[PDB]
Every structure is written in structure tokens, then in C-alpha cells.
Design a protein around this ligand. Structure first.
Ligand SMILES: Cc1cc2nc3c(=O)[nH]c(=O)nc-3n(C[C@H](O)[C@H](O)[C@H](O)COP(=O)(O)OP(=O)(O)OC[C@H]3O[C@@H](n4cnc5c(N)ncnc54)[C@H](O)[C@@H]3O)c2cc1C
Ligand SMILES: CCCC[C@H](CC)CO
Length: 392
């Protein structure tokens, strides 16, 4: 009974969503909209109040972009998103101002997630918090489908062994800070000092708060002795490194979230048995390309569309795997190309700002464009204008 359900399209479907983050919540709510008679419920391992990170950048003013999760809220303005049109690359303490690609929409992660949870509950999707998911065999025997949307937390779950992740740990160490400095432009700040290489990724996301992600190379992390330093001492050191940008503003990290090597989680299949993966759980990519939540939304929408079709679950999950895996691997490659550029920027500091901007702008040049694949996926997920649904 770990076999994937078969035969016909099911009007009677019992689905568990493991994880109450953007991927799980967009999926659960969009799926319940498409199939109002299905039994969809969410379990979340953490307390309701726990939400990691500070702000996120998202594409466009809502609701222009179907990949922006704010586009799925009736009052996104209540979260006071911040709209950024300019990018400031700081190199050798010299600023270079330029236009962004799409309006960047910075918003608090906590309020985004809480609004999508409340939407899910209002539509009749139950969420159970502090719920360690049951064993595989329990879930297989209790559910028709298990949608695994639990982020990079792979060791917390026992899935079929075909779904075993490939883990790669980044060379830089990073920490996700919040600060009361206000960055009205998206800031990418390169600062080498006697300990090593430090990069700051900063943007305002509320009236009062900015995200300030800091990564450093292994030389900087060892020389600055950041592992032995306390949370406060490390934050004091980093605030001194970035005093030109922060002024006298401080840096805070979230509970239990400290310095990390970025975990690029990859899979070789999106689905097995009753289990199908979306969002970071299917594929994670370095945050330096700004696509994580966008991928969470687009993968969720893709799975909803395949499960909405008049086909059996096995054919639907196969359809998802064959559409989602190529997108996820393209995302991974773009994110890796960016991640690798940041791991080696210490070997590029002699360049001018204009030339470092050009190197940064070219770091994904050899890959097919990620946006082309995203748009193609949304074209499918959103449906097309045709009297009768048919294959293209
Ligand atoms: C430093 C940093 C900066 C980033 N900046 C941005 C940005 O600007 N823009 C952007 O779009 N993205 C950004 N991202 C990426 C973004 O945070 C993720 O890509 C996105 O949240 C993935 O959503 P998700 O739903 O797949 O997973 P998550 O948001 O990780 O949600 C997973 C949920 O499942 C829960 N869970 C885990 N295990 C279990 C279990 N066993 N049972 C039940 N529940 C479980 C977790 O507690 C959590 O609530 C950044 C990431 C980092 C690290
Ligand atoms: C597309 C802009 C992405 C900004 C992101 C902030 C974490 C990385 O620099």
C-alpha cells in the first residue's frame, strides 16, 4: 500500500502536505481551489510562531507576477512590502547605482507565511503545528498522496530511498541578519579586510527593517574566529566590517539560526510512491539569485495543474516529475553559477566597480535563461485560452 494510486482520476483524495511554508501553502490552497472535494491538510513540525529569516525579495508589485506569493493574498499591502527599483553595488567603498531588472518586492517572511496559513485555514485546510509527521508506513496507510514541502530539512523525514537527496555544502559561510538600517536600494557590498572576504546582501523590507545577509569565505571565517565568537560578538564584528553601510545600526539573527554553509539539496526524481516533493525540498539553490520563493510558488502551481487533470495520480506525478525536474535543475545550475562566483570573488578584487559589475552580470551567461523556463512552466500551470482543454 506504498504504491502510487492508480486506475482513474480520484474524486476521493486524501492528501497530506508536510510543511507549512510558501510551497506547501500555495500548493494546499491552490489545490483545494481546483478540487474543492479533496481532503487536504497540513502538518508543521515547528511551533506556529517559528518562522526563519527576515525579509525576502520577490518579483514585481503584486499581483503583476503569478510567481509572487503576495499575488495570492487579498490584501498584500497589509504586510507593507517595499518596492525597490535600484541596485547599488559597493566595491572599494565606492557605490555604483543602476536599475534592477524587475521591481524588487521586499516583504517580511513571517507575515507572508502567516497570511498564507490563514488563507489555507479559511478555505478549510487544517494546519496542525508541533506535529512531528508520522512514519512513512503510517502515512502511506493513511493518505492517498504525501506532498513533501518541508524545505531543506531532509533528515527529519523518512521518504522512499529513490528520493534520497544529493547534498552539497557551500564554501562560504553565511548568516541571515535583520537590521534597523534602511536600504532603499538593493545593496551588494564587497569588503575585503585583513581576515578575508565578506559580502553583504541588503534591502529594506518594512518601514523599520532590512535584510542583511552576510557571507564570508573560509579564510575570513577562520581568521575572524567567528565560530568561537558568541552571537553578540560575531554580530558586533560584522557590524564593524559594514559600518559604512550600517552606521550605528545593529544586527540580529533568528533563534537557533547561526552561521551556515549553504546546503544545495538536489534530487534525481521528484516523486515516488505516494510521495512528491516541491519547493526547497525538491531543489534548493544559493540565495544569491533571489529565486527561492519564486521556485516554491511555480513548483507548487505545476503540481496543482498535473493533479487537476483528468488522469490517474501515477500519470499526474510522472507528468510533474518530467516538467519540474528540468526546471529545478536549471534553477540549481543558475544558483550554483552564482554561488561559485561569490566563493571566488576574493580573486577579483583588483577589478574596477564597472568591471566587477560586468563579471557579476555575466556569471550565469552560459546557461539557458531561467526566466524562459519559468514562463513556460507558468504557461502550462495557469492554463491556456482554448474552448476545450487539449494537449500541446
Ligand atoms: C539567507 C537566505 C536568504 C534568502 N533570501 C530570499 C529572498 O530574498 N527571496 C526568495 O524568494 N527566497 C529567498 N531565500 C530562499 C527561501 O527562504 C526559500 O527558498 C523558501 O522559503 C522555500 O520555501 P519552501 O516552502 O520550499 O520551504 P520552507 O520555507 O523552508 O518551509 C518548510 C516548512 O516545513 C517545515 N518542516 C520541516 N520539516 C518538517 C517535518 N518533518 N514535518 C513538518 N513540517 C516540517 C519547516 O519548519 C517549515 O515551516 C533565502 C534563503 C536564505 C537561506
Ligand atoms: C534579485 C535580487 C536578489 C537579492 C538577494 C538578497 C538575499 C541576493 O542578493
Amino acid at each position: 500500500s506504498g504504491l502510487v494510486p492508480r486506475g482513474s482520476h480520484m474524486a476521493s483524495m486524501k492528501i497530506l502536505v508536510i510543511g507549512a511554508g510558501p510551497a506547501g501553502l500555495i500548493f494546499a490552497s491552490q489545490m483545494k481551489q481546483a478540487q474543492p472535494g479533496w481532503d487536504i491538510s497540513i502538518v508543521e513540525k515547528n511551533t506556529q510562531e517559528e518562522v526563519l529569516g527576515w525579509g525576502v525579495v520577490l518579483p514585481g508589485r503584486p499581483p503583476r507576477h503569478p510567481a509572487n506569493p503576495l499575488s495570492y493574498l487579498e490584501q498584500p499591502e497589509r504586510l507593507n512590502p517595499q518596492y525597490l527599483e535600484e541596485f547599488k553595488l559597493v566595491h572599494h567603498d565606492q557605490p555604483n547605482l543602476m536599475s534592477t531588472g524587475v521591481t524588487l518586492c521586499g516583504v517580511e517572511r513571517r507575515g507572508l507565511v502567516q497570511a498564507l496559513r490563514a488563507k489555507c485555514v479559511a478555505a478549510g485546510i487544517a494546519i496542525s503545528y508541533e506535529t512531528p509527521p508520522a512514519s512513512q508506513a503510517q502515512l502511506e496507510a493513511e493518505y492517498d498522496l504525501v506532498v513533501v514541502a518541508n524545505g531543506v530539512n531532509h533528515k527529519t523525514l523518512q521518504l522512499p530511498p529513490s528520493l534520497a537527496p544529493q547534498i552539497d555544502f557551500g564554501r562560504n559561510k553565511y548568516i541571515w541578519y535583520g537590521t534597523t538600517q534602511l536600504f532603499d536600494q538593493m545593496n551588494l557590498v564587497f569588503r575585503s579586510n585583513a581576515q578575508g572576504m565578506f559580502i553583504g546582501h541588503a534591502y529594506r523590507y518594512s518601514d523599520t527593517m532590512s535584510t542583511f545577509v552576510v557571507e564570508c569565505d573560509e579564510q575570513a571565517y577562520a581568521r575572524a574566529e567567528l565560530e568561537m565568537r558568541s552571537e553578540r560578538d560575531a554580530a558586533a564584528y560584522i557590524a564593524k566590517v559594514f559600518e559604512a553601510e550600517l552606521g550605528g545600526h545593529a544586527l540580529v539573527s533568528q533563534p537557533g539560526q547561526g552561521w551556515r554553509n549553504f546546503m544545495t539539496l538536489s534530487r534525481e526524481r521528484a516523486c515516488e510512491g505516494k510521495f512528491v516533493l516541491i519547493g526547497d525540498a525538491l531543489q534548493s539553490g544559493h540565495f544569491s539569485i533571489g529565486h527561492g520563493t519564486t521556485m516554491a510558488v511555480v513548483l507548487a502551481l505545476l503540481l496543482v495543474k498535473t493533479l487537476s487533470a483528468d488522469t490517474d495520480p501515477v500519470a499526474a506525478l510522472d507528468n510533474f516529475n518530467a516538467r519540474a525536474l528540468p526546471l529545478a535543475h536549471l534553477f540549481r545550475d543558475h544558483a550554483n553559477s552564482s554561488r561559485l562566483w561569490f566563493e571566488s570573488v576574493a580573486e577579483r578584487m583588483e577589478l574596477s566597480n564597472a568591471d566587477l559589475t560586468a563579471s557579476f552580470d555575466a556569471r550565469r551567461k552560459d546557461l539557458p535563461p531561467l526566466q524562459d523556463a519559468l514562463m513556460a512552466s507558468l504557461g502550462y500551470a495557469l492554463g491556456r485560452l482554448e474552448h476545450h482543454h487539449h494537449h500541446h
